[PDB]
Design a protein around this nucleic acid. Structure first.
Ligand SMILES: [Mg+2]
Ligand SMILES: [Mg+2]
Ligand SMILES: [Mg+2]
Lengths: 191, 195, 348, 139, 109
RNA sequence: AGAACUGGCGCUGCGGGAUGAACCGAACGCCGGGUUAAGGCGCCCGAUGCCGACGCUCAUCAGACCCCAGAAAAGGUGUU
RNA sequence: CGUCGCUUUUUGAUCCUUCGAUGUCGGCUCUUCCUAUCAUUGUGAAGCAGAAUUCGCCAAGCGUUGGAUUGUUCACCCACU
RNA sequence: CCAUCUGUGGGAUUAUGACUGAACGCCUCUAAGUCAGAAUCCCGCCCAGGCGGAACGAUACGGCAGCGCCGCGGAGCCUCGGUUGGCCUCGGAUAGCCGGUCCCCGCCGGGGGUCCGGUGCGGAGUGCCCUUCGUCCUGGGAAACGGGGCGCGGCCGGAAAGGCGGCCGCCCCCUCGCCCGUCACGCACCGCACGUUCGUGGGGAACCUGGCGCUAAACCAUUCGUAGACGACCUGCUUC
């Protein structure tokens, strides 16, 4: 079709101040700072208005599958406002039958060392993407918590535990064993 | 004398088609920094059609047979080779006015390099379509000189940012030196006929 | 079409030009790649095999049936007198490979280096390096010889050491030293180059380079067997007795339609005398040989803690075809590439 | 980023084609790659020019959408484009590029002799600043 | 005391794909790359100056190792501003890529 | 394998179809200038080195010019 | 019940090349290639509890034997894997 | 295998399982963007080293010769090709370029406010030389460095193929090394081509030629047997 432009706007609260180098978006907030580069996506980024700080991403002309990519800009941008003002927290619990799944943390949250996964002698040292850290939970059994500012660094690192506790050569309809995520929340709440 | 073509940002066959016509016509052409040549289509596709080229091999001995070069200076050289009549002596000499290099050698790091707008990626690809670098499709297939080339380029490019430091030091000076006085009589006739 | 019975290829195609090697001394194709976090050391060393014996040892190995029992092992021994450092080479990394930057040879060079630089030491005037030694002593050459070290330190990044053997300490006939060129893998290239300026024209023993119960490589040229047939060079099966015109031949050497014999088929030619690398040879003992005359000649080799007898490792009657080992040695578990009296290069 | 748009009234230059070098005003767009333009005071009348042939400037004009020839003409001169066009640095570049193009053989002699005279004087007064630069940095 | 000739190179002969017509050359005069701007060069006298080892000269009266083949520009060739041109001998085919020398003779300007 | 009508090949070069008996143009004394046919004009390789027009299409098996030298039923919230 | 295809390891059909000759079965020996995968690697699906099987996927890297009867190709049996 | 010893790791990923996330207000492994990922693949290890380079050694006496290096002028032989050079940022492309107060990295560079220009004019549709016939007489503008060097000496700069460059001290020297004007001559060879450069190019061979330097090594024969069909290969041959 090659339509005349589309645009989404992003309402930005005051405790986060966004600058842009170009198609790079620099997001600074209370609990740190994080940046992305969108130099592959062929759009313009214009932050408009004083005192209100609106961010309008608009793509002129464009094909239908390049109309689908202006919404992907503003959704990654809102997850940078959210992550730098509230953080991300993925709570994962250990689902197991007869064998308990023992889990510790070796180095400062950066290493999770899983052992006794379904009676096995082989350890599973899962290192994490830099920026996230772990915690054994309190007032709940067998739970692990992951906290950080970037959702792609929390969730990919959450997938490295869930992929490591994988049952081979067996039925996975029974033998439900592993450390699966349970909740998708934030570090600071109710804001 | 010789045109010096900086190879990066160019496409493989659009650049090689212009060189293979300028070199039958009697010019000397030096293509420099072939590591940065783009090639259209995504990287996995261009890496497949070079691995399909590698299995082309004469059965009875591979020592005689197709010589699969691995440096991007020679990948680009064999692309120009296939656009020249290289089995005649009018085409043997045509391959010999082409000195294609890799990185930028010490004769050629201090010459002004030209580009070809007829073969640049920005001009000739539509930007929503993918491309492959010739640097890492060489590296994925058998080339062992990527890191020792990038080390020498960032030492080469650092010796030129101090050259361009002091080149625009002179340009700031001679723009303030032309501020002064009494050359207005000569600017009467140059502004009149395109300063 | 389709042999009816599977069978694998005879011989390996990874050693395929079964050729007389172009070198008698084994060439290190690859030294160990370093990081500068290690202390400064050598990596390779020349040696001459004398022959083999065997051994008895109390092998500790839990799990096995070999545990806490005496087990014999074939051992070769290699006579290694100390090397003597002559040269320093510098290699600068390029986008075409390593390239020799320049070399600096020692202030005064031995008799047996200089014999390696000739094809007829008898007819020669013995004139090699005679004008090169006079740039160590003149004032103008000396300031631009130590400038070639300061330019070596600036640009080139891997440096090597030219060292030769002392053939005078050996029972052989040869008296030409073998001149090797071995890589130092220390820390920075300033400390790596100052460690060799310190120690030109000086001896480097074999215990300073290698250690006991440490595992190395052996590089050399094999026993030469000559021009041998298909069934001995390639271990092809003999044909039956009834075969006209010959037993020890390969019968079919190709199909019709590739109308051309392949490299992958077996046919007769030179067997043996090939350049090979054995990997993972353990050192059993570093020897020390025929020391000071205060006690007139302490032989004392092969005298273990459980032996306590005045023995020496050279066998009763001498090493066959070799001579009599008066120098340091390294003994290696198992078989080792080469004839007796052959230069083989040990390498970490 | 995208400081000048096509728009009803946007005064465009014309690079190539059979109306090359003259200005137009975009009156109406038709579909995606062609636009109805006219120049009422610059001798290119109402017709459809493609966008890759035209050349957007910083001048807008205020007249109603798809007007007649007269109301573009009144808007062309109430804004006084043709005086304001020629006093910009890009109309001076397109004028100077065809002053050099018509430089005859005798005039190119005079452009020569009065160039090597001033290149001496600029090279004297830029080398009398090199001596002045080390004398500053000598203390 | 100065060059008075345009720079050309001899590219090839007038050919189809297989058979070629040796009697007319075709030339790429430099700087002109459009058919509309080659009307200046029609009728100009072009020359192929080359070296030998025997001796010949016209003007000075003392011979040298230089000799020449004279020709003239006939018509344009294609849209790319090159030119076909017919000499008084045929070109040696040694000169493929080498220059020839396009003068400023028989010019209306 | 066997007939009908017409043309051709055999007896026939030439331009083109990369290659070629028969396809497509065109038939031929020896040459110069001009212009075309079929086919083409990124580079082999003459000629688009036109500021050519409108759209369609992404292939981890893309497509690419009569004869003609490789595909079907069926299917796709892939895109138009 | 249908119905669309592929392949040229079956057998035909045809008669283009060869009749001033292309040495015609099988085995043995030996090299390479293909994939329409028996096994080995990584996997998805079961009427997958485990064990064992079964059906697909990337994949031809590496293996695919010792014998009795028979000129056998083919067969069939013993045994190992 | 009838004795004995040894057989070695990295990359990008296929299948597949995922993450973020639209299209399609949700959902979604995919559309852009990321992850894990293998007997495959590519390299390493290992084998061979190219009409492919490199670093370094010594370089022909004898009794006359002989050979390198530097500075030469002279004539002839062979191969011909070119007619002025640009001595350089990175790069982005839905973005770039320049100049500049303040905050920091051993008197340079990075950040931001500020000002510009921007179909690029601090524009290779360009810029520096120049299209310079020479000279003489004779005035203005410019110009106080002198500029060509076979000078002499010193510095440090350039290792990816540095073979090229910058600076300084003394020196035989110029005071026209430019622009405008004055005066008047040089082959004015009587209309005509191969003119005008690179350039005292490259290669070979000898002569007249000043100075500084050098005094070898291969191959055969003989020997060896770590080697061999033959060549090849590994070695010995000191007056102890
Ligand atoms: Mg190596
Ligand atoms: Mg064997
Ligand atoms: Mg017809």
């Amino acid at each position: 079709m090659k339509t005349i432009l589309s645009n989404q706007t992003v309402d930005i609260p005051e405790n986060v101040d966004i600058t842009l180098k170009g198609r790079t978006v620099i997001v600074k907030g209370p609990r740190g700072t994080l940046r992305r580069d969108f130099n592959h996506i062929n759009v313009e980024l214009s932050l408009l208005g004083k005192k209100k700080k609106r961010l309008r991403v608009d793509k002129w002309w464009g094909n239908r599958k390049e109309l689908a990519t202006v919404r992907t800009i503003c959704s990654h941008v809102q997850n940078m406002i959210k992550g730098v003002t509230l953080g991300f927290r993925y709570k994962m619990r250990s689902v197991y039958a007869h064998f308990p799944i023992n889990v510790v943390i070796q180095e400062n949250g950066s290493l999770v060392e899983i052992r006794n996964f379904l009676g096995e002698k082989y350890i599973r040292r899962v290192r994490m993407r830099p920026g996230v850290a772990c915690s054994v939970s309190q007032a709940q059994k067998d739970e692990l918590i992951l906290e950080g500012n970037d959702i792609e660094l929390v969730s990919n690192s959450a997938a490295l535990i869930q992929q490591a506790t994988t049952v081979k050569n067996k039925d996975i309809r029974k033998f439900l064993d592993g450390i699966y995520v349970s909740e998708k929340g934030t570090v600071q709440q109710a804001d | 004398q010789v045109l010096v073509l900086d190879g990066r940002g160019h496409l493989l066959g659009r650049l090689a088609a212009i060189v293979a016509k300028q070199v039958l016509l009697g010019r000397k052409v030096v293509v420099v920094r072939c590591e940065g040549i783009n090639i259209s289509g995504n990287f996995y596709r261009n890496k497949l059609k070079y691995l399909a080229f590698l299995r082309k091999r004469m059965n009875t001995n591979p020592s005689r047979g197709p010589y699969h070069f691995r440096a991007p200076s020679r990948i680009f050289w064999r692309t120009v080779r296939g656009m020249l009549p290289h089995k005649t002596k009018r085409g043997q000499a045509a391959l010999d006015r082409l000195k294609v290099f890799d990185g930028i050698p010490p004769p050629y790091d201090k010459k002004k390099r030209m580009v070809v707008p007829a073969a640049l990626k920005v001009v000739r690809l539509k930007p929503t379509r993918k491309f492959a670098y010739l640097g890492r499709l060489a590296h994925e297939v058998g080339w062992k000189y990527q890191a020792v080339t990038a080390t020498l380029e960032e030492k080469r490019k650092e010796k030129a940012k101090i050259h361009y430091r002091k080149k625009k030091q002179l340009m700031r000076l001679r723009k303030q030196a032309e501020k002064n006085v009494e050359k207005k009589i000569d600017k009467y006739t140059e502004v009149l006929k395109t300063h | 079409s389709h042999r009816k019975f599977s069978a694998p290829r005879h011989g390996s195609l990874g050693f395929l030009p079964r050729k007389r090697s172009s070198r008698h001394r084994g060439k290190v194709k690859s030294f160990p790649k370093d990081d500068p976090s290690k202390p400064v050391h050598l990596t390779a060393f020349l040696g001459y095999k004398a022959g083999m014996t065997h051994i008895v040892r109390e092998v500790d190995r839990p799990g096995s049936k070999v545990n806490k029992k005496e087990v014999v092992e074939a051992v070769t021994i290699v006579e290694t007198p100390p090397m003597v450092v002559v040269g320093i080479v510098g290699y600068v990394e390029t986008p075409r490979g390593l390239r020799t930057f320049k070399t600096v040879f020692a202030e005064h060079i031995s008799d047996e280096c200089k014999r390696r630089f000739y094809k007829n030491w008898h007819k020669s005037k013995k004139k090699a390096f005679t004008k090169y030694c006079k740039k160590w002593q003149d004032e103008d050459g000396k300031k631009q010889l130590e400038k070639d070290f300061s330019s070596m330190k600036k640009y080139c990044q891997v440096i090597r050491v030219i060292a030769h053997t002392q053939m005078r300490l050996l029972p052989l006939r040869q008296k030409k030293a073998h001149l090797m060129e071995i890589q130092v893998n220390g820390g920075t290239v300033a400390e790596k180059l100052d460690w060799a300026r310190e120690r030109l024209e000086q001896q480097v023993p074999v215990n300073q380079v290698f250690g006991q119960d440490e595992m190395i490589d052996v590089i050399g040229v094999t026993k030469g067997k000559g021009y041998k047939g298909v069934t001995s060079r390639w271990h092809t099966k003999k044909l039956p007795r009834k075969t006209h015109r010959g037993l020890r031949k390969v019968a079919c050497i190709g199909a019709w339609h590739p109308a051309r014999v392949a490299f992958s088929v077996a046919r007769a030619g030179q067997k043996g005398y090939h350049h090979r690398t054995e990997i993972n040879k353990k050192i059993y003992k570093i020897g020390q040989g025929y020391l000071i005359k205060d006690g007139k000649l302490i032989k004392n080799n092969a005298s273990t803690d459980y032996d306590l007898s005045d023995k020496s490792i050279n066998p009763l009657g001498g090493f066959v075809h070799y001579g009599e080992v008066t120098n340091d040695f390294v003994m290696l578990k198992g078989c080792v590439v080469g004839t007796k009296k052959r230069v083989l290069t040990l390498r970490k | 980023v995208f400081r000048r748009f096509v728009e009803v009234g946007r005064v465009a230059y014309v690079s190539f084609g059979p109306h090359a070098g003259k200005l137009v005003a975009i009156v109406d767009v038709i579909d995606q790659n062609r636009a109805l333009v006219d120049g009422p005071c610059t001798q290119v009348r109402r017709q459809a020019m493609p966008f890759k042939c035209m050349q957007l400037t910083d001048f807008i004009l205020k007249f109603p959408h798809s007007a007649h020839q007269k109301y573009v003409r009144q808007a062309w001169q109430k804004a006084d484009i043709n005086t304001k066009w020629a006093a910009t640095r890009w109309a001076k570049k397109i004028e100077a590029r065809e002053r050099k193009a018509k430089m005859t053989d005798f005039d190119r002699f005079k452009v020569m002799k009065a160039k090597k005279m001033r290149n001496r004087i600029i090279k004297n007064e830029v080398k009398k600043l090199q001596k002045a630069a080390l004398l500053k940095a000598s203390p | 005391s100065g060059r008075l000739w345009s720079k050309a190179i001899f590219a090839g002969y007038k050919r189809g794909l297989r058979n070629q017509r040796e009697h007319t050359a075709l030339l790429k005069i430099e700087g002109v790359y459009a058919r509309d701007e080659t009307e200046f060069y029609l009728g100009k006298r072009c020359a192929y100056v080359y070296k030998a080892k025997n001796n010949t000269v016209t003007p000075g009266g003392k011979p040298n190792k230089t000799r020449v083949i004279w020709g003239k520009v006939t018509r344009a060739h294609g849209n790319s501003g090159m030119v076909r041109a017919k000499f008084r001998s045929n070109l040696p085919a040694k000169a493929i890529g080498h220059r020839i020398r396009v003068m400023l003779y028989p010019s209306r300007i």
